[PDB]
Nucleic acid binder design. Structure first.
Lengths: 171, 126
RNA sequence: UGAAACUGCGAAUGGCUCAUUAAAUCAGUUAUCGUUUAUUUGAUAGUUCCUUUACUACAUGGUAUAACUGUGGUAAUUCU
RNA sequence: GAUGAUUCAUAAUAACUUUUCGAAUCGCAUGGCCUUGUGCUGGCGAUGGUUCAUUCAAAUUUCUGCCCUAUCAACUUUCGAUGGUAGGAUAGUGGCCUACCAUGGUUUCAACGGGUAACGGGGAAUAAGGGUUCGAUUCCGGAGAGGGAGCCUGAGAAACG
RNA sequence: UUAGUGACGCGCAUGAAUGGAUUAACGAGAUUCCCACUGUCCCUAUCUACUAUCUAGCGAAACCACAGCCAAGGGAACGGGC
RNA sequence: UUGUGGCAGUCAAGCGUUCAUAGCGACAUUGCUUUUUGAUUCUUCGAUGUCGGCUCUUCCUAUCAUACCGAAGCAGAAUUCG
RNA sequence: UGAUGAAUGUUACCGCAAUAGUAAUUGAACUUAGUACGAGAGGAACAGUUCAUUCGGAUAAUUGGUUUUUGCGGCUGUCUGAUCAGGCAUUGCCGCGAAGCUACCAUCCGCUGGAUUAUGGCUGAACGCCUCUAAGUCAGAAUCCAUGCUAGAACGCGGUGAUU
RNA sequence: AUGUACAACGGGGUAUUGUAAGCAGUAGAGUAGCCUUGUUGUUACGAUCUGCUGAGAUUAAGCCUUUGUUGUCUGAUUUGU
């Protein structure tokens, strides 16, 4: 199948195409949120332990947490719940979704690294990505730097420099 | 070959063993024995039948396979380079917490400038 | 200045048709001392520190989350 | 104090409440007092909030009135029909619903039932006068979104772009 | 559908107390059809009891010219005998 | 016994666009059969259980089909005679 | 129809095979082929493959039926003082129900070789030619006879063992 | 006719049915009674429910198996080339 994996410490993420039914039978008969060792599926992932966060079956239907039932169903979905974006206030809709349990019916798994092995990955571990923004709240900054109730957040601001042309500015 | 699960009792159904009933909702049921089939046709409920997998489940019998999920207690432990931060300079700014006297001197210079600006505004009004 | 997205409002107005419906609608005429009412308009909270003598930030408290970055699923949907 | 009239308005005591509301909001102006501190005060607005009233309404509702049919004369009441008591529900009255009880209610002044090629009115046509026929349709009020039932959101829908 | 039912009617040979026609109800009457039901059937299988069976005891009858393998022949034209 | 019934032949006037005989076959005629009905009265009237159906076996062939073949007015297909 | 059995020196085992009987059956579909043939319309066949019909012989792994397994449980009435456990209800009733029996209601299987008929032919006379025929001869049918299948002559037999 | 002998029992396996009795329970429609008046108050009744309990019973009479226990294993008749 395919594995969309994420190393959240770096903040990076990468896809991996996979074969070997008898390596992915480890993932078979599992739920979302459980943990799984990595060398069981690939020696490249030796010492790695992964958590599952989601998946998308063939025909496009996602999964949902602790629903049950490795097959598909239809469910009524509303606000403050995944898999449904309401286009009208109070709206609800009966959508098809796939269960939480893992099986061969998936084209994709969504994996996240909770602990690193010993060999490092070129796409996740070596590289790192930035936090594309910084705080905007005063106390958020004050605890970001752990300063005080007095330490001039206006001095501890972060500014981004853009180069529209020859002229640049720190925003 | 596949192996199957009695729709009533929950039992592995090996080939050439049991039956298969197709109901006019196009729904398929599988039986390992005329016992469970007769009960299905008598339209009983396995949750009330005491020897079926579903009953043992609903009554939590020998079901210690699953135990519990634990709770996570671990900080982020990654000062991410926010990309307007210059993570080295970000650690420098995080370590430069003391020396608020510079902020105080800047505030005093700003106070002097604000007084001068108020005076200039009053003079221009005059 | 200003796309996108969050938020607030609106989307129940209007427009179309006359199928139902014969004390039902409806007309004119009463009543709410029997009731709800966004919006408007005009008025309108000194009293909330909880053993309320250190229990507290009151120059002012905290957490997410979109948009966005990037990885993808799907044949396809104002899907995710 | 008011009303034609109240257990009205309003106020007061005792407690209750999973505890509501009583501004951690925004723009423009930036001014006065000084024991000159980022000291204390300070304007014109936008937004938001409890309650009352008002306005926009809404829901129920009194009285009088509707075409043709007796080759429809008895209808309603089992399982709500008329009423009473109490309670639930309602935003609120009320058989609106439930429990208990009584046996009532409508009718030749046409009930009930059936039919309508019937949405009702304001009004249109034609007329000496009286009248007859029509009115889906430019305004008002209703109902409906292919047929039925249901429901979230909201002040407001049994919503249908 | 040679059945049944309704109709037609120059009716071998209908017909009026030799009673005619009709008829609610009734009927161990006769008849047809439909619904349900079924081992009547497709198409048969299995179980039970008492029998049959074997044994102990008891113990008959009908019938009997003599008796008891067939084919054909001829023969009173279909014999166990020739 | 075989009129009657059934079955098969001989001949060949004609039908068959022509052409007696592919397939048919008039007038006439030779036969077979006992699954028709008759005729007869031999056997049985001191009793041979009477129609049909159900069931079951076997036989005959004058073969409906199936196997092989021949002929055609048999191009194929289908059909017909043997 | 099936089943015993005297006497053959005894007893036992393995066998032979005279005679008798005999069984397999029919069709469709794909392909051959929209080919051959035919103007066209239409429309084959042999071989091959997968299946099936009628019949037969078995079998009971599976499914189904049967239930005195009176096996487990349940139910009504009555009786044992109640309980527990049971009796009776001409198998009390109900559901499940193994084992056994069993079903084209289930599953499996159902042989090939020769000699021929009709008919078509070879050579070839009779008849100097011609002819399947007269002599000889070839191939040939769901035919017959064997192979195979079932009994095993109880007056049909063999080999072999131990024989007081 | 003294042994991988045979049987009767027992045990185990396999099957069938469907969770035994008994005990306990702050389970239980509700209803009476109590007084220490209750601040679950407790006692009694009460279909049934839950746990011990896929438990218990039956299981070869034509099922499998046995390192167990207890037994049994010389009666009669006839036969000759």
């Amino acid at each position: 199948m395919k594995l969309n994996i994420s190393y959240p410490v770096n903040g990076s993420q990468k896809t991996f195409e996979i074969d070997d039914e008898h390596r992915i039978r480890v993932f078979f008969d599992k739920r979302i949120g459980q943990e799984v060792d990595g060398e069981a599926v690939g020696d490249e992932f030796k010492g790695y332990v992964f958590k599952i966060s989601g998946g998308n079956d063939k025909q496009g239907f996602p999964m949902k947490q602790g629903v049950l039932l490795p097959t598909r169903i239809k469910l009524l979905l509303t606000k403050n719940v995944s898999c449904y974006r309401p286009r009208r206030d109070g709206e609800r809709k009966r959508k098809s979704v796939r269960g939480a349990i893992v099986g061969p019916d998936l084209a994709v798994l969504a994996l996240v690294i909770v602990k690193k092995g010993e060999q490092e990955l070129e796409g996740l571990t070596d590289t790192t990505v930035p936090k594309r923004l910084g705080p905007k709240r005063a106390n958020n900054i004050r605890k970001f730097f752990g300063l005080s109730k007095e330490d001039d957040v206006r001095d501890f601001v972060i500014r981004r420099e853009v180069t529209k042309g020859e002229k640049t500015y720190t925003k | 070959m596949k192996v199957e699960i009695d729709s009533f009792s929950g039992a592995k159904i090996y080939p050439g063993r049991g039956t298969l009933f197709v109901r006019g909702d196009s729904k398929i049921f599988r039986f390992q024995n005329s016992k469970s089939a007769s009960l299905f046709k008598q339209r009983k409920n396995p949750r009330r039948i005491a020897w079926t997998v579903l009953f043992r489940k609903h009554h939590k019998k020998g079901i210690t396979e699953e135990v519990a999920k634990k709770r996570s207690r671990k900080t982020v432990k990654a000062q991410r380079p926010i990309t307007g931060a210059s993570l080295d300079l970000i650690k420098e700014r995080r370590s430069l917490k003391p020396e608020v006297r510079k902020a105080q001197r800047e505030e005093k210079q700003k106070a002097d400038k604000e007084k001068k600006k108020a005076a200039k505004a009053a003079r221009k009004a005059e």
